[PDB]
């Protein structure tokens, strides 16, 4: 039950990704498991976001 | 979208070419600064009257 979900963290966002992993650990379940792919980028950059 | 994006060299030259232009046109004197905004223009101030 692998669920692929993309994610976007602005470079310099740390505590957000931390709380993100903590959320992943606490809300993890035997039924299904979320499989995030993280890519850090410039959030203000439209090109980077599109890519 | 191919990552990492690679720009062509010629582009910078074409940009400079476009920005360095000074011509006469329907908008009056046409010239640009480094950022590409209009410089040395004339905006006619008009009033609607009876005639
Ligand atoms: C042309 O535009 C530039 C930018 O605003 C200004 O510095 C300069 O004085 C202008 N030249 C004339 C002759 O109006």
UniProtKB/Swiss-Prot annotation, chain B:
Tissue and organ distribution: Detected in forebrain. Detected in dendrites of neuronal cells. Expressed in the pyramidal cell layers of CA1 and CA3 and in the granule cell layer of the dentate gyrus.
Upregulation: Down-regulated in the pyramidal cell layer of CA1 in the hippocampus by global ischemia.
Processing after translation: Palmitoylated. Depalmitoylated upon L-glutamate stimulation. Ubiquitinated by RNF167, leading to its degradation.
Compartmental location: Cell membrane; Postsynaptic cell membrane; Postsynaptic density membrane
Glycosylation sites: 40
Top-level taxon: Eukaryota
Function: Ionotropic glutamate receptor that functions as a ligand-gated cation channel, gated by L-glutamate and glutamatergic agonists such as alpha-amino-3-hydroxy-5-methyl-4-isoxazolepropionic acid (AMPA), quisqualic acid, and kainic acid. L-glutamate acts as an excitatory neurotransmitter at many synapses in the central nervous system and plays an important role in fast excitatory synaptic transmission.
Domain notes: The M4 transmembrane segment mediates tetramerization and is required for cell surface expression.
Family: Belongs to the glutamate-gated ion channel (TC 1.A.10.1) family. GRIA2 subfamily.
Subunit structure and binding partners: Homotetramer or heterotetramer of pore-forming glutamate receptor subunits. Tetramers may be formed by the dimerization of dimers. May interact with MPP4. Forms a ternary complex with GRIP1 and CSPG4. Interacts with ATAD1 in an ATP-dependent manner. ATAD1-catalyzed ATP hydrolysis disrupts binding to ATAD1 and to GRIP1 and leads to AMPAR complex disassembly. Interacts with GRIP2. Interacts with GRIP1. Interacts with NSF via its C-terminus. Interacts with CACNG2, PICK1 and GRIP2. Interacts with GRIA1 and SYNDIG1. Part of a complex containing GRIA2, NSF and NAPA and/or NAPB.
Additional remark text: The postsynaptic actions of L-glutamate are mediated by a variety of receptors that are named according to their selective agonists. This receptor binds AMPA (quisqualate) > L-glutamate > kainate.
Name under which the protein is recorded: Glutamate receptor 2
Organism field: Rattus norvegicus (Rat)
Name of the gene encoding the protein in the UniProt record: Gria2
Full protein: residues contained: 331 to 381 of 883
């Amino acid at each position: 039950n692998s669920i692929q979900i993309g994610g976007l963290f602005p470079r310099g966002a740390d505590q957000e990704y931390s709380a993100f992993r903590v959320g992943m650990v606490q809300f993890s379940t035997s039924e299904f498991r979320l499989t995030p792919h993280i890519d850090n980028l410039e959030v203000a950059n439209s090109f980077a976001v599109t890519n | 979208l191919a990552n990492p994006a690679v720009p062509w060299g010629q582009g910078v030259e074409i940009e400079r070419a476009l920005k360095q232009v000074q011509v006469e046109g329907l908008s009056g004197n046409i010239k640009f600064d480094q950022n590409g905004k209009r410089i040395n223009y004339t905006i006619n101030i008009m009033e609607l009257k009876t005639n």
